[PDB]
Design a protein around this ligand. Sequence first.
Ligand SMILES: OC[C@H]1O[C@H](O[C@H]2[C@H](O)[C@@H](O)[C@@H](O[C@H]3[C@H](O)[C@@H](O)[C@@H](O)O[C@@H]3CO)O[C@@H]2CO)[C@H](O)[C@@H](O)[C@@H]1O
Ligand SMILES: OC[C@H]1O[C@H](O[C@H]2[C@H](O)[C@@H](O)[C@@H](O[C@H]3[C@H](O)[C@@H](O)[C@@H](O)O[C@@H]3CO)O[C@@H]2CO)[C@H](O)[C@@H](O)[C@@H]1O
Ligand SMILES: *Cc1c(COP(=O)(O)O)cnc(C)c1O
Ligand SMILES: *Cc1c(COP(=O)(O)O)cnc(C)c1O
Lengths: 824, 824
Amino acid sequence: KISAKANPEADDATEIAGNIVYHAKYSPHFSPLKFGPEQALYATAESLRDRLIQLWNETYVHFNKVDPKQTYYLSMEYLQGRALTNAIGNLNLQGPYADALRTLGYELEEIAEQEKDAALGNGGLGRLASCFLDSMATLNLPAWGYGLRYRHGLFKQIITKKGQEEIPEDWLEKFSPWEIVRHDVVFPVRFFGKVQVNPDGSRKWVDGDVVQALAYDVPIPGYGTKNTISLRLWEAKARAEDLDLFQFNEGEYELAAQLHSRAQQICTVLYPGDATENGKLLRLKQQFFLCSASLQDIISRFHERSTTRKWSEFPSKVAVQMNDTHPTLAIPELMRLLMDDNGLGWDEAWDVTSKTVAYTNHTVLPEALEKWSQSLMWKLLPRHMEIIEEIDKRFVQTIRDTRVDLEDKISSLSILDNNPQKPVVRMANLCVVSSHTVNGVAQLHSDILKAELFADYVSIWPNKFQNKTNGITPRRWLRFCSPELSDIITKWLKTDKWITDLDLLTGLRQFADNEELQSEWASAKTANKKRLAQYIERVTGVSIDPTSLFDIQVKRIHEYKRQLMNILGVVYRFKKLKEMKPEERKKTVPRTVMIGGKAFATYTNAKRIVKLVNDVGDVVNSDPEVNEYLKVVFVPNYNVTVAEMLIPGSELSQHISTAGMEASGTSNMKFALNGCLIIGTLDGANVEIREEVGEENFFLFGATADQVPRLRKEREDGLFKPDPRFEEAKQFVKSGVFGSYDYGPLLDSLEGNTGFGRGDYFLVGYDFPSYMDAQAKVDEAYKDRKGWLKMSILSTAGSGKFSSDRTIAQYAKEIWNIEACPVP
Amino acid sequence: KISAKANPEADDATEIAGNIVYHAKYSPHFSPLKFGPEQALYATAESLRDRLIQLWNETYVHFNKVDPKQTYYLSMEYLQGRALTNAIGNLNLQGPYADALRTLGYELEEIAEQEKDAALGNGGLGRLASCFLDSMATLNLPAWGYGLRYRHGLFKQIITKKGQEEIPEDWLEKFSPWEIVRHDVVFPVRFFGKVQVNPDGSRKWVDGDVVQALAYDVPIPGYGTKNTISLRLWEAKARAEDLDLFQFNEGEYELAAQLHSRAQQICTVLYPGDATENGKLLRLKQQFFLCSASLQDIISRFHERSTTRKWSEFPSKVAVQMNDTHPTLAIPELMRLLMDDNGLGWDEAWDVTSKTVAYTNHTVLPEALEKWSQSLMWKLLPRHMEIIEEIDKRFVQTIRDTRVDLEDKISSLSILDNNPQKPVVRMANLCVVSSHTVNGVAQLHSDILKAELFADYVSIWPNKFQNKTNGITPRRWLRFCSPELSDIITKWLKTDKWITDLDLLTGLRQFADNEELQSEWASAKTANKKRLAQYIERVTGVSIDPTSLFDIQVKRIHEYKRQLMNILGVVYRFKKLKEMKPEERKKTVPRTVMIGGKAFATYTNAKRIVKLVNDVGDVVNSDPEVNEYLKVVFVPNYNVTVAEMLIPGSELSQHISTAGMEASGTSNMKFALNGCLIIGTLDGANVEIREEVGEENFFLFGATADQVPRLRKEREDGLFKPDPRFEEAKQFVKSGVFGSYDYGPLLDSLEGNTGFGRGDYFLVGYDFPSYMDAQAKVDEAYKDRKGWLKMSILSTAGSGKFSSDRTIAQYAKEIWNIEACPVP
Ligand SMILES: OC[C@H]1O[C@H](O[C@H]2[C@H](O)[C@@H](O)[C@@H](O[C@H]3[C@H](O)[C@@H](O)[C@@H](O)O[C@@H]3CO)O[C@@H]2CO)[C@H](O)[C@@H](O)[C@@H]1O
Ligand SMILES: OC[C@H]1O[C@H](O[C@H]2[C@H](O)[C@@H](O)[C@@H](O[C@H]3[C@H](O)[C@@H](O)[C@@H](O)O[C@@H]3CO)O[C@@H]2CO)[C@H](O)[C@@H](O)[C@@H]1O
Ligand SMILES: *Cc1c(COP(=O)(O)O)cnc(C)c1O
Ligand SMILES: *Cc1c(COP(=O)(O)O)cnc(C)c1O
């Protein structure tokens, strides 16, 4: 009935309905008879993109006129998730859009479910990046992100009888309605080739392969602001003229299209397998391609703002932030662009580069810092190796000529490790030496960087090193994912200003004992639990009881994350439930356990752990004697959407990594913000959460990070004494109770005292008893409903500090020296 | 200045200007700073596509409600050219769009020049297809075309010092604003695999590769009607799930993506080189892909129109027309879809197939009819070979049962040639045996098919064979490419109804001697010649004199087309001009010779001819003693756009193929319609043109088709006597006058009496003298300006018969049994 009428600025139900129908008809991607939910999604998204374009454009023009110092965030991952709910929310158009879609015959919820997540990231590195973008927008900061437009993500995880199987993502196999292609924004990116030395001493990278980098903008709208910034993504492309027709017409199709194939490879998947030289080269190509395209674009915008400019202004007008060591090549690439393409001398280009770049480190373990073969780097990126060797020459000369106390450490401090067997470039060393600031992501992590990992560098530059505690946006992670709870918070604080000033949540503490609030709290959590139930049934086929305790663990599958401990706990609780009399079973607290996460495909034990969880669920969930008191579900394809479904409905979440292994952990912060209590080790963000929410609202257990090496040494000296419940759990897994899959090889990782891959290095067995004791505390606290709801309210009430708004403001002031630039 | 305001139905300058700016802003493909000619082009096209969508939709719905019999035209080529001018013209929005672009700061002409031709075809087969689509739309016929969405055409021709070089077309490297993707219209297409026999006797093609066939519609608007039909184009695609991640992550990138690569190959170029087994298989895959995707879509639309349907209705509701033998596989594919996917028995599916399919043949030479190795067919399309062998078994049984006088000819009449040395499938035989109608494309061609090529088949089915003389649309080829001449015609006929009733042009004959008309005619031709001069200067750098005689030959470069005869004529003319006294040179008619066309890349002598034309021009054009009387220019990258520039400005065109070699030739018709006289052999469309325009208005020469074999035999018997002027032309080319390129090997094709590639089989030497005598007649006729202009007017006046509207109306009534279905 509703007729097409374009209105790019539609802000009421009737105008918005007209604009959606306009796109359906005049921006078609389907046959015109079809107006199903999927077609309704694309039309709605295109209706919203109209407003996004207006704002993006206004923002671009304003930043152009003002010529503020601008920050560019370089990341190999962005976990954008779905864009619909967030776009509608930040434009504060919820009611009008929900009403428009109703007049067109749909519930907004159903349409929202059609959207595929943007497969542009994998883990916490990427979701941090995504949260940061939302906060940069909302704080009106002149800042952008750059990334790669990956076609297939890491992988879509499916769960079969074999356990995890890995299939390419398909989010772009029709189209993304959010992105805007910029066919004028193309930069050449080189690979391989060699260095031409000119008579005047200048140098030029020549020959090799040249790919085209094409820009796509993804608009990022701020909450309660016109300010709309960009996640500018690159697509690697060959030109038509790069296809060799002679070869094609001889039947040599692969040779004919070899440039197109190498360009496609760059944006196929994140973290392509790098056991072989091909893979190592591919990963390096992706990092270089990000770096080179992004820096060419940045330099081009710097010049475009010239009202007449001097290169001395560059580090007063540009900040480049490296998320982890993946964008390390920005350092030598910026030197290359300055000196070769722009004529600067080494000293002037170094002064610019060292004042522009900053490095954020996300790791405790020095073994985990990136290193590349010097031969591979010479092959792919000869001119950059020239620049890197010069950076290292100068640095080492300075240590030799000023720090004689460090002479014996030059072999570890240098960027180039000239080990006779496997000479490498130490990318973290390149980052620390070159960057004006280096930061960690939690206080303890940052102290560990200063005191252990980079101590000799701290000695050289005692003001280089800073902390910036991670955070999460309360838009995506509370306001938009839990609207009913958000309405309760607004009502009781008598303001909605908490959405941009999350510290206002402490105003809930005075009401934590108030039974009317506890009632409304409980109703909210229950609603979310029924929605979650529905979802889990939909996607795993298992019915789950929403009056049961929802216990959730969702992280990357990995021995140090200790999913294996959780699952052995479940196996023990199952066994005891089975042995109990039915009269005794009625005393226990019913529980639905939910584990999810992806396993790196080639990581054998991680894949065995996923298989184990599923085999355990298959048995427990189908056992009519205890399945009223316990169910276990492996939740597949964990991504932002899945987190948006689980987090609002969560009651207990598990953050149980071996102490000392986690720098941070932002999912912890999401769960705490949503009233979900944590069972956790004293590690990463758990430390700060427990501080802010109060130790009485947190379930702590396990060895502490300083005990861990002592306890490993006790194991090696044969002094470990396994708890009987742990031994019984193990045996039961080895009993055959969970089918014909031999779990013996997985569990052998927990056996013995010595050997790589043996001796329970992650202290599954040692922590097990305090872990089970904590789970007993959870049960007892759960049975006291009023006490539970009080703890849940305090958890939300104490979450203010974890806002990514706080984090980004600190970066803005202390590292980038940028400020708000609100679009009028 | 002008503000964005969407108006899909914009019909005046101000509304249209707003809609263009609306697309520029809200359908962006560029950074928002840029509004150059290219960006203007895209925005203007999108503005027009708005109107095209409305009409396409209205048309689709109307055909759906009516359930008329509908024709589907299958072609491996469409020469669509540029769409802008044609779209504006058919919507009769010329004035409003030219004014809109002027208010936005542009001339429509400049915007028009930004458009890349759709590289979807190569030659006359494809432009015929494109003309037919325009006439289907204009005559309100329920008819569509199906084609492949080729990414890179055949090739873009560049001319370098080496002559022709071939580069991939790039029309899709940003996007095409005309097409509409239909993500719900996807069909599976199989290759290789094997045939499963089921216990119930049914058979199923299984295994092998499976690609996805995705539809894109290109709207084809009719002149003076709402009726807008489709050229539906297929893209071959792999699914994301077809990428093998294990292999990708092992560094085996080619293996990982091998399905994606085989899908991409299908739509890379037209006519991929087929000397090797790979290429033969790729060409077959392209034909099968077209056929299978198209027929699945047709069957799906047949069912979608059901009001309740019976299969007996299918051939009353569907006609499939095969343009040449490339869609031969529609016959067995339609039997496969009917019997396997839809459950029909052989006899019912054959009755349906034989009444649905018809075949248009375009060939005089039996050596030219497509044949494929039986083994290759078995490998790629096993189920189709099963069906083909059954068709052939039954047909041969029919000859035994009913036409025992043909028993001895079964080995030539059968579809399967079981020659022990080279067993093949004869695709033409399959087409003739299966189709209810077979037609040729000119009266003489059709008589040759009945009397020689398929005589025994005519004997079996004496009503199968028909003629349908080709034609051209007077919209693209007169009304839109020559607006000024069109305005003169309208003024003198006192009507513009000729645009859809081209036989009205005979009303110009009474005026062919009228001095005022001749004056206006000349003025019109002169304006077109100056535009052509500009263009030639732009695209070759050669400055040409528009008061000279413009002599044009534009066809595929080939020894039988006899560009080599033309160029040797030019070389002789140049030599005589140089030898003349300047007093004598002033007696001659100045001439600009223009040759163009593409050479197949591996066809050595064709490429040598392109080089020769360029080397001759380089010398003549830069010779200040005769370049006032002669210039020669090779016009590069001949395509629809180039013909749109040359044809309106042409005075003489050359259609000089060896007699008996051409079935038709539509470019002949386009020239005749535009008042350009023809120097030509008695062959192809020249026969009918000369009849219609009058023998006094045509320059005929050369051997006739009945003489050709006798003359070839005389050459073999050593009785040929070369004309001295021919010999002198040859020698001068061998003199070194045209640079260091040795033309000896090229000319060796004209030497000797026997040998493949030798002995002047195309009668260049024999026809040369009557050719030079005709060119002499042209010069004399040119000097009599009134007599020339009378002949030019008579040429246009007699061109009515060559309308594609006549051609399609005949197909509609006599072959498809479809009728007008005007959209209200
Ligand atoms: O302003 C001085 C100078 O700076 C730049 O030269 C640097 C090169 O760009 C860089 O490769 C490196 O040069 C070394 C070569 O790699 C090596 O092969 C050998 O020749 O030693 C060189 C010096 O150590 O370092 C220099 C400068 O230190 C810029 O390219 C010059 O144009 C510019 O004049
Ligand atoms: O008419 C009913 C019957 O028709 C269809 O069968 C045909 C097959 O589809 C077709 O291939 C061909 O089959 C021959 C096989 O190719 C070959 O192996 C040979 O040895 O024997 C077969 C029979 O000639 O011909 C038959 C029809 O003559 C349809 O698929 C059947 O299900 C249906 O029963
Ligand atoms: C927040 C989030 C993460 C990061 O969580 P960690 O605690 O570091 O494991 C990862 N994936 C998704 C989908 C997230 O939403
Ligand atoms: C009309 C046309 C053709 C068909 O020409 P023939 O005379 O059949 O060779 C080929 N190419 C182009 C660009 C045309 O416009």
